[PDB]
Amino acid sequence: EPVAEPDIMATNRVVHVITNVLQ
Amino acid sequence: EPVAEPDIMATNRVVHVITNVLQ
Amino acid sequence: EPVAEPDIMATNRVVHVITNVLQ
Amino acid sequence: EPVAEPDIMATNRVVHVITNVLQ
Amino acid sequence: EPVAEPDIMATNRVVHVITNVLQ
Amino acid sequence: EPVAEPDIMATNRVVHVITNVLQ
Amino acid sequence: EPVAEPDIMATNRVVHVITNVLQ
Amino acid sequence: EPVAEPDIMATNRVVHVITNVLQ
Amino acid sequence: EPVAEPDIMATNRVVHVITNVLQ
Amino acid sequence: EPVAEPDIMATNRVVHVITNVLQ
Amino acid sequence: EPVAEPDIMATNRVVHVITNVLQ
Amino acid sequence: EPVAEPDIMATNRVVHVITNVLQ
Amino acid sequence: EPVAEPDIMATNRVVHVITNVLQ
Amino acid sequence: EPVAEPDIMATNRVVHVITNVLQ
Amino acid sequence: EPVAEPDIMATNRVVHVITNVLQ
Amino acid sequence: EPVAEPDIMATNRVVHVITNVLQ
Amino acid sequence: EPVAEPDIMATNRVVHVITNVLQ
Amino acid sequence: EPVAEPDIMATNRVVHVITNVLQ
Amino acid sequence: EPVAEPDIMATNRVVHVITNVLQ
Amino acid sequence: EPVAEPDIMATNRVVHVITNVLQ
């Protein structure tokens, strides 16, 4: 909820999953 | 309320599912 | 409310799934 | 709902599904 | 969304599903 | 090299290999 | 080499290789 | 070199390979 | 080695490998 | 060469592999 | 400008039962 | 001007029961 | 002018039962 | 400008039962 | 703004049972 | 009695390479 | 007494590579 | 009495590589 | 009496590489 | 009585590489 003077920003959501099963 | 200095913005949602299953 | 400098933007949503098999 | 000068755009939604099987 | 002059545009949603056969 | 009176023994070797695939 | 009197023994070797396929 | 009085005995070797994958 | 009085005995070698994946 | 009275005995080698996935 | 590309559902279901007999 | 692209869907379900008998 | 991107989904459920008997 | 940003979700359930018997 | 921002969440459940009897 | 019963052998080798081109 | 029963053998080697280019 | 039973074996080796470029 | 029972063995080797770039 | 017990073993190797860059 940006409500102030103008500035620089960004919105980039990233998700990653990694796993190594040994059995 | 996404408002700020005129600039470039892109809602690029990156998703990836990786897993090294042995079976 | 995306209001800023008149620019071009396009969503680059990509999805990929990969696994392995061994029996 | 972005607005700008008459420009060109396109939804580059790509989807891929690949796995492996030994049978 | 684009609401400018009637320009050329069309969705290009590509899809591919293939599996490795072995039997 | 088992040697003795006649018996009704017999081998019952069976193999089972199941594998799932979701494509 | 199970040698003995002439009995009625016999081998019952059977193979079973089942695999699931989606296609 | 199994040599002795007669008796009942039969080999019942069985193998099972189970596996599951969630694509 | 088995060279004594008669006694019931038989091999029951069995293998079972279980594995799962949650992705 | 375990020689003695006819006592009950039978070899049975069992193996099991278990893993706890965490993602 | 209501536009939406088509879609197809690739529903699959596999099931079988096997019960031999020696007799 | 409602817009919403579709998504691929595929419900997988495997189940089987096997029971042997020597008689 | 509602907007809402979709999300890939897939229900996974596998189960099996086996009851071996030597008789 | 009502917009929804759902997250990725997928159900996972794997279980197996075995009850051997020599009879 | 009328925009939601849910948190990542996924159901996880892994359990198994094994039994054996010599009889 | 130097004799060995027959037995089927499972051996295969599959390979595939796909590459998209735009030009 | 050179005698040895056969056994099932499963040997495989799968490999695949996918690439993309926009030019 | 040169006798030696066989053993189950299944060698496998899977490998895959994926790359992407927008140019 | 040169006899020696074997043991279960299976060479496992899985590896993958990924290099994502937006350019 | 030349009988030497075996040695249980199981080769396991899991490794992966990832290099994400936005450029």
Swiss-Prot record, chains A, B, C, D, E, F, G, H, I, J, K, L, M, N, O, P, Q, R, S, T:
<comment type="subunit">
    <text>Binds to type I, II, and IV collagens.</text>
</comment>
<protein>
    <recommendedName>
        <fullName>Transforming growth factor-beta-induced protein ig-h3</fullName>
    </recommendedName>
</protein>
<comment type="function">
    <text>Plays a role in cell adhesion. May play a role in cell-collagen interactions.</text>
</comment>
